Amino acid sequence: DVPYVLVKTNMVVTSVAMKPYEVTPTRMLVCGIAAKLGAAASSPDAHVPFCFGKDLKRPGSSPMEVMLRAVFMQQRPLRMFLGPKQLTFEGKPALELIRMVECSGKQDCP
Amino acid sequence: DVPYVLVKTNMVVTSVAMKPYEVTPTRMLVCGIAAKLGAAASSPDAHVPFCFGKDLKRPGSSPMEVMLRAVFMQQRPLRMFLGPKQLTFEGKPALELIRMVECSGKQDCP
Amino acid sequence: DVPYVLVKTNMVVTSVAMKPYEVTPTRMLVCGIAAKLGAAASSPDAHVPFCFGKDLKRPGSSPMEVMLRAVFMQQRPLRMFLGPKQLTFEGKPALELIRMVECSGKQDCP
Amino acid sequence: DVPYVLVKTNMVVTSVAMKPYEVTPTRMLVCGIAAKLGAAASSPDAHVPFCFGKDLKRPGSSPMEVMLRAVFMQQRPLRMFLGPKQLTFEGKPALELIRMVECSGKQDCP
Amino acid sequence: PGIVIPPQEQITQHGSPYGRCANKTRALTVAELRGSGDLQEYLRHVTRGWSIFALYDGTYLGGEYGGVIKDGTPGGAFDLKTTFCIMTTRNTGQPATDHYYSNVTATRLLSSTNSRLCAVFVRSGQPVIGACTSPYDGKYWSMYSRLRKMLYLIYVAGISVRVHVSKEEQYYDYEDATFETYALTGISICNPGSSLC
Amino acid sequence: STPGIVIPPQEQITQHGSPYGRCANKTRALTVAELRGSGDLQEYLRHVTRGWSIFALYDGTYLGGEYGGVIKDGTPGGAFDLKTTFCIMTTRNTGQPATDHYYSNVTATRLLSSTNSRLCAVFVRSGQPVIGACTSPYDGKYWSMYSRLRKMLYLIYVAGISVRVHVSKEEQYYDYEDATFETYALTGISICNPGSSLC
Amino acid sequence: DPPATVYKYDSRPPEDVFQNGFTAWGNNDNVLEHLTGRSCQVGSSNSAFVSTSSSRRYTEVYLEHRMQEAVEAERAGRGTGHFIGYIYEVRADNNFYGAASSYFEYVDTYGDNAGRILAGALATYQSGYLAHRRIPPENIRRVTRVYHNGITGETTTTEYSNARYVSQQTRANPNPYTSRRSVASIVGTLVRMAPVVGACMARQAESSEEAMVLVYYESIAYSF
Amino acid sequence: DPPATVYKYDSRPPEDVFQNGFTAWGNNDNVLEHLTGRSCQVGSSNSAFVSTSSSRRYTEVYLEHRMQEAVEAERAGRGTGHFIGYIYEVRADNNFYGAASSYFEYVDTYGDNAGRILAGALATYQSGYLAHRRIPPENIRRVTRVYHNGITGETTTTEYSNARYVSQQTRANPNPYTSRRSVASIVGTLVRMAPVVGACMARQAESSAMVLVYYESIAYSF
Amino acid sequence: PGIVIPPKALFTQQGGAYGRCPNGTRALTVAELRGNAELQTYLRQITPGWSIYGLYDGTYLGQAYGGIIKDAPPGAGFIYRETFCITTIYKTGQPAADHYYSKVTATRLLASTNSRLCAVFVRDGQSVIGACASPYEGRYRDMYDALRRLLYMIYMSGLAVRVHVSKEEQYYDYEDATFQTYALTGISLCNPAASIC
Amino acid sequence: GIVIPPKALFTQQGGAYGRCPNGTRALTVAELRGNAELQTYLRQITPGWSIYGLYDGTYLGQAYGGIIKDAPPGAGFIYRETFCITTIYKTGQPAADHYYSKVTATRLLASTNSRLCAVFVRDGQSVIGACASPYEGRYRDMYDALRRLLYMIYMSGLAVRVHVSKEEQYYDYEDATFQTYALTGISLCNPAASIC
Amino acid sequence: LPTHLYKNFTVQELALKLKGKNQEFCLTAFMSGRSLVRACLSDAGHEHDTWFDTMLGFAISAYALKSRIALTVEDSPYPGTPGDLLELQICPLNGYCE
Amino acid sequence: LPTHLYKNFTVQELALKLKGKNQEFCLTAFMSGRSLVRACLSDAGHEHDTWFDTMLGFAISAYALKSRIALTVEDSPYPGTPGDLLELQICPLNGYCE
């Protein structure tokens, strides 16, 4: 885990993923990679791994799944609330996405 | 009802449909029209009506529904296993689609 | 209060004080001002206010009181463990001194 | 004992002592020698033995003990209220010190 | 332009550690607190000591500090022990009457853990209304599986619609919103003057 | 980092870590060098730690669980912003006899004190630590000695007096971080002449 | 390695193409606008590129499905069932730029939010190559004429060589085509369905000698 | 404002002082070492400063207690009881530097751990002024001779003026005295007890052993 | 060049009636039967005299003929009463460890009644691996509803992915497959910058 | 102007031959002369030809006409009854914190089973008086600690910021030109840390 | 209970709203020079059937594809009110139903 | 039980140790032409008294001041063993006891 919630602004979801959840069999992980616009390729913000839980007992698509598919397809800049919890994605740690809001302009995403 | 299972090759799903199932209210029919590539308009293989059952008690999309949507959208040639059972579609009989596999080449689909 | 324990190194107790404890009448506060060696006069580390509790029910001088008097008299550099709790001293906030250890050299006090 | 309380002015505590109390085991005597400033060596005021009781049941230093230490260390002139009771110190009688006040100037200490 | 101030009853009884407001709640902002006399007075009354609290984009210096609101950065003070959180849901008590907004496009999506999918419906590049849908809570939970399909379609294709809302539930999911947000009850892709609208 | 330091045995670690980098009274934060020098603690932590959890040490971090058990260098209190800090109990009843142990020609240096716990000093000779000795009114077999010992210790410390220090090995203390000396219960201070019976 | 040979499906006969070649609709050289199909819409056709594919199988597959549509139209009583399709074999030069390569260069220059994931996915899948402004007759080598009789199911495939063709040891440009950032409003990637083909690839082949149905790829990529 | 007049208690008579003056023990101009009293110890006296006080009351108080010690010595059969003390009135110039001012400048230059809180407290309390290397006979204005007979308790106070004194409109240096960081081992501030007086102030007045203790070891009660 | 041979144990006891192999089973091929010496040995002991059996691409003649495997076009042998079927699911007993294949595209779909949805993952025009998911059976059956949505998208878009499988279950849905088929556990879209493919 | 002790403090049964009981001290001529209300009470309680003792004087009976005659310290202690005043007075003022900056602890006072007092001075002038005792008062538990810091600042002469409570007023110092209150705190001056 | 069949119409309108207590999705089928065909489906009562969710998804797909459709509409018991959608067919993409 | 009064000696040694169960403090008084005077005080019967703490503090003060002292030492019942300290006096600072 990370000590506190990180707020990453002007983030574009570059890739999406699906994988099982190690600790709970009745749940799974909806993962992805987000990139900060204008950030250097060497910077860690240029490829931020993230994951969020999905209840396998409940049928359908959760609000976070619906938004992720739409914002990924349209490459929309986001304001992401990541952590404190860390999950596993491609053998490496990934911050838990707890909330996401699309950017309106310079005021909410400087 | 036809006596044995028919194996139709190089078939493209031209039309898709949804209708209720007459004998069971907890079930419905996912229907369509299949056509053999390069076949004459007069030939019976140019118009092959087909249907498959869908459980209304179960939420979501069945493997056959998922494939049907994809192969219809992309007009992919298939190997269709039709019959022996016959269902009703547009007042006329339609063969029951029990299995479908996409064509790999001229070897499996001559 | 402050979020976490601060570890201030190369600190010299410049002033000492005594005052009553507002929340508990059976306890009092032994306060003081600590200054980081080589720090700028404008910097907040050049005058760090601190306080520690003293049990009035128990007669005598506590280990922290004994050390404070000695390190203040001899102007000895210290490693001060301050916070998270904040107490009142001269109307302004002061970090709670929970532990203090005298500097041995540049290793423990860089 | 002496008939009435003596008020000796411009007195400096020249020596301090500690000894047990003969009549009570739960108490002790804090004794000393006081000398009048500018007085002749032959005069009895040049060497005034004094004692005061200390409760051994109570822990700590009494207001008289604290002041005695300070006025002895700094040789401060005092107004001493001695008697009527007489105690034993070095086999000879010594007046009981009941109250002492430091000299402010020529007015209170002529 | 003015912003929507969440009423006093929205603040949680206890703050949140690690800058992680509980599900169905979100961090109170500087502009929202500054615009709320009710909250400022409530905090001055309940806050004690030399305690500094976190807001979404700043801090609240309470207790012995007096009740000072300082500017910051998004999540810039989440390292503090306590973050001020406001509950996103509010039962308005208003009737179930139909309220609609014509020629609107769904923009600026919002989602959070175990809560709701939200969209800002705009016209002439300006927000008109915010509308939310969720399968977890609310009177219209059964509408979610249906509304998410319509909303996804109109969002990705940029379709101009007539949006229907219920004012029975008001939401405060969007920070410093210049629009009100209610329960989504309908989406209509229709022709002008149609009975289907 | 530095070897040859006193390693607090495995039984000293607390069952649960501490928030805000504030180890409970009578306990202190475990260091990088102490953990690196302890095979028992490293094996204990690898066994109990889960997930991608990073824990705070006094002057670094312990990357446990899925990280493997990596110990990284840092700064004093540089990682106290983390959720959990590893703490070790400062007191240990050795079980050793009450025999008198003394160290001659030593000067009291490097004082240590903490909330509801002992006052400590490092007794040195030729600019090198010989032994550490502690006195406390709150706990230990020799609590009644504190009010007396503190007066002697204050005097010898401020005036820089060379003494003969007496300790009891019945209680061992781990108050000092990365100590190149053992620390025991202070039982006596002697300002004496060489070969004196008063020593 | 860049390809020396590219292919193009068209409805235009060789007595037209072998003499006139292929000319782009306008001078809009914007990479994103072409790959999203915005510069290939009806009444908005001003693209400065001619769509070609390095894969013959891709052009063959499109022809085959256009042929099946003619059969479907006959069964619905909307056509004769007869179909004539052409696949032109074109020699590529430094005037031919990789569609996928040009797209990823645009995104690397103007940021991730300046592109569309499906526009890049389409360009790669189509194995597209964009020829700037014109493909002269000297580049067009051969043509495969595919005739079909929907009534009998007979397919006639005849090859024709171009007399105006000039042989060279040239290949496509190894560098991507670069353009200014698009200031136009782009909702999504316009595609023709059954199979999914880019708007520019499909519209350029179409010739009047019933308007084409174009949809956003983003609205159909995920199932409802 | 800096003082034009400083005072000094001494056992030396005017016949010697009005002709020779006051000369420092050595050339060790270290501010801390003097204010600590390290450069004023028996067998370690090498201080480059002559201790004086801007307060006459301070020098009067010290003389008064040295007088009482002579009476105490007589009662103990260790002396005659007779005492002769002198308070010299000295005109200060730019060679006279403030003890407290010089101390705080040293601490501001080399850090808090380079000083002692009681050394600064003492310098302020003594109202000390350090004259570098020498006090010429031309600077000494007047002397107050205080004679006491311990047996009778009679105190005789007689004033004497210096003929060699030069009248000038000069005052003490407004700037502090600066020196290099002390490399010597300093345990604490050396003071003479009853009353607490700095080692340099007390030892310089003494003329033919003096009990010197660390101020730090007695500042707090045991 | 070499095809995957289904183990002898998969052979259905009571085969399909006139080509209709029961749910969870498909018709056995001539190349798969010719490649299995152990199955051919079992067949000779169970097949009675002057009996003709059906296959997908052939026919099997009885023990009186001498156990002849004769080729036929697809579904020609379905005219006969008993068809040779094989159970598509095989419990390998291999460790549940994660196995992945980078830069692969989802192609050639397969679906059957009350059974799996399969895909063939291809790289550089060559088949790498096969992956299946079903809401009816398997360890990862609860994950089907989610995995099918991402599989459909990557199939539609042709986007390169890293496919994750568990070799705990081996599938034999694809007839005469030159690739191994396992249970689909995860899909991750390639991101070279994020060290994915 | 000197501080006058209120009439209520006057001990009903005074000290025997100068020995004022614990917690009380001998009244002065200037304090009695400054209290008109006490002089009025004195005339009604003092019988005929009785002579009373004071610290720096004597008081003549009502047959003489209530005469306050001056005397050297302790001269009037030869008489049977001495006029004593209770040193502690419950002011009834709010328990608010009052402080005085840049003050030095001087002129100590101590008496049997009572208070330790100090006079806090600035620029050679008396500012305020502060007392502490382990036997009585609200801040009696704080005595053991406060006496250690008071001793140190007295010994060193270090400038301090003294904190007092005006809840209790003390009359230990005879003919004081300063007010005396209960010692609550001491803070050593630090100009850099905004203390004095 | 009389049902009517319609061929080669396009989805011009698609709406999902509340009709009192129950949820209702309605579509408008258009053919040049013909009156608009309005067909609705309601989740009344309704017993746990994916029927409403399945048909809505299919109608959205038909709208998103901009394709021609074939539909069976049962007459409403109330005059003026749109009929009940029983069957829906997506005609060949870029083509027509036969 | 014979007590001896010593005058104008200086504290040369001062030790605080454990003597079995009880705590003990010992001092050594020095005068140039005389033999060392060793005196000890024990906590033995002062478990409820403050006698030990008071005397120890006074002896430390006498040592810290480097002053001359006067002390009354009661003879030990065992020869060679230091006597019992009953009284302690700090002589005039910079002076002598009379």
Numbering used by the authors:
A (entry chain D), B (entry chain E), C (entry chain J), D (entry chain K): 1 to 110
E (entry chain B), I (entry chain C): 3 to 199
F (entry chain H): 1 to 199
G (entry chain A): 2 to 210, 221 to 235
H (entry chain G): 2 to 209, 222 to 235
J (entry chain I): 4 to 199
K (entry chain F), L (entry chain L): 2 to 99
Paper passage:
This exotoxin is a multimeric, 105 kDa protein, composed of five subunits arranged in a typical A–B structure. PTx is an ADP-ribosylase that catalyzes the transfer of an ADP-ribose group from an NAD+ substrate to a cysteine residue of the α-subunit of the trimeric GTP-binding protein (G protein). Ribosylation of these G proteins impairs the binding of G proteins to the G protein-coupled receptor, on the host cell membrane, promoting adenylate cyclase activity that causes an increase in the intracellular levels of cAMP.
From these, a variant with a double mutation in the S1 subunit substituting Arg9 by Lys and Glu129 by Gly (PT-9K/129G) has been shown to completely abolish the toxic effects and has displayed the lowest enzymatic activity of the many variants generated. In addition, the space group between PTx and gdPT was the same with nearly identical cell dimensions and crystal packing interfaces. Despite the minor differences observed between gdPT and the previously reported PTx structural data, the double mutation (R9K/E129G) in the catalytic site of subunit S1 (the A-domain) does not appear to affect the overall folding of the protein. In PTx, Arg9 forms hydrogen bonding interactions with Ser52 and Asp11. The incorporation of Lys in position 9 maintains the hydrogen bonding with Ser52; however, it induced substantial changes in the hydrogen bonding network. When examining the effect of the E129G substitution, all interactions at position 129 (His35, as well as the hydrogen bonding with Gln127) were lost. The changes in the hydrogen bonding network due to either R9K or E129G mutations did not modify the shape of the catalytic pocket. These results indicate that the double mutation does not alter the overall architecture of the active site, despite changes in the hydrogen bonding network surrounding Arg9 and Gly129 residues. Regions with increased deuterium uptake are more solvent accessible (red); this is a result of either greater structural flexibility in the protein sequence or changes in protein conformation. Since the crystal structure of gdPT did not show any differences in protein conformation, it can be inferred that the R9K and E129G mutations result in increased conformational flexibility in the catalytic core of the subunit. The rigidification of this mobile loop, along with increased flexibility in the catalytic cleft are predicted to impair NAD+ binding within the catalytic site.
